[PDB]
Design a protein around this nucleic acid. Sequence first.
DNA 1: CGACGTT
Length: 604
Amino acid sequence: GPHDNYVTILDEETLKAWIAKLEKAPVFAFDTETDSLDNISANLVGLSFAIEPGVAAYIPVAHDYLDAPDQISRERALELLKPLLEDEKALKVGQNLKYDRGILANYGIELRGIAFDTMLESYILNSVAGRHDMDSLAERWLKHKTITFEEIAGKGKNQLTFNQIALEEAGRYAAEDADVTLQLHLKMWPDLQKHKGPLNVFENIEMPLVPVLSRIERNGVKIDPKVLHNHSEELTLRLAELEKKAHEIAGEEFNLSSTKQLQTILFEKQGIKPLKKTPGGAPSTSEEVLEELALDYPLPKVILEYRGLAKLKSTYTDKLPLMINPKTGRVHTSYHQAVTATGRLSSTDPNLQNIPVRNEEGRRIRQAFIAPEDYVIVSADYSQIELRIMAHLSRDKGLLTAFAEGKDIHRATAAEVFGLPLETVTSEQRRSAKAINFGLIYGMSAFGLARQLNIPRKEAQKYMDLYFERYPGVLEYMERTRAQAKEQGYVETLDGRRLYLPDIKSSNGARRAAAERAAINAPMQGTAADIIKRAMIAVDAWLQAEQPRVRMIMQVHDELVFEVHKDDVDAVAKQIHQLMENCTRLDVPLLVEVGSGENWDQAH
DNA sequence: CGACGTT
Ligand SMILES: [Mg+2]
């Protein structure tokens, strides 16, 4: 791990020399460092170029501390770099490219040279290794503890924004970052080349996602804060009523939110035997315990209602109005592309993928999302996608025929399990088969179904036996995947995304069963994520080539909520439809139930 | 309720 060959650029002539080197440089790093953690309101501070291993350059453009000398104009430097950054033939490399690209696009410079991202490379190679962050990557691959931002800043309010930070420390840190990316690239890229499936997915599914991810995050979803600042008042009043009722039942004032106090007061005053126990050993008070106890006493019911209301209020109705970006008035999310192992995108700060649906008050919370003016929400959706991947990967004629004909999968499964035809499949049989399908997706055991269906576990096993006998190809494929995990350990999805299992041969019964379940459902969710990502890429290509009156705002799991102008709804819905069924060459069709509701809940 | 685990 070399160092000290780090030249910091203060004059534009050295910048010209560096760009002359860069335009002949095949691959090079790019790591813009910025004061603000935000990707939208942040103002750029400096850049970083590392054409050759150890040969890294930091280019300050605005430093705020006393006597920051010869600061190149942030506009002049970017104007001189526009031929380079906006070049397609120059392949770049970095970390979290949807951050650098967003920061650059703040100034109108649309970057186009992205080809490698160390985060994405580390994700594709071994998705269950570390956390895919520079600090972890450093020792995990290069075996070189790098300088963190904490040393320069210091935890707490004492932490310093990067812009006023002294020249030497900031420059050496950024150049070390750039240089590191190069070492990580030069080390991992041969490994990424040796793996054909991972190479395919990395080139075609993961990396073209970065520009559309940045565009989606910068577009942001619009919320009507008045709805939440109204609705929280009714939430507070209702929970106050629940407080009054609970303190009437118990005769004392306390906090329903606390769990230790709640279990103590409950199990000492009313004294029901603890049905279940927490993983920590204490008596458990989860929702099942709540409903079982509310079968007997009203205080469990009222505290369950308090939990239900308070969770949604505190998590959404209070946090979302706070997170509205004041500059543009739209909530901006950070889709972390590589954090979950399976492959799904997971929105963070705030979790837009975690908006309530099943509760009517959750329906109100989803109604809080609206359109600015003359616009209307289009909520794309894949219906029962996981079962479609199951049919494709099982090669079972029954499910393939059922999906090709287009009948509801749940009633068809119930018909094939119980014998009576699908038209006579009633509601209880229907959601019984629904539980069968979902559980088989997740790999759960018969006790789980006795819990999720309130039927004896013997009857659960009998029902799965009927299903398994009528669908032997699915079981054969699942056993093939289980066995494949033994000698390969990287049970793999369709498009080549892998998952290394360090728990397949753990020789422990507890871990291996969960490892087997993960091996079962890994191709499932992996294929679903790849299909969604490819649909995202195609739709983004359509918008960026045609520029219609549509803006993609969010990507929930198997959902692609848009925002269209009122007069476009007739044709753009059909166009995105066609773009999405033609997304992936899979035999079973990919049904897309496009809504066109005025608000997100209405479109849902 | 049945398979996994240990004294
Ligand atoms: Mg970076």
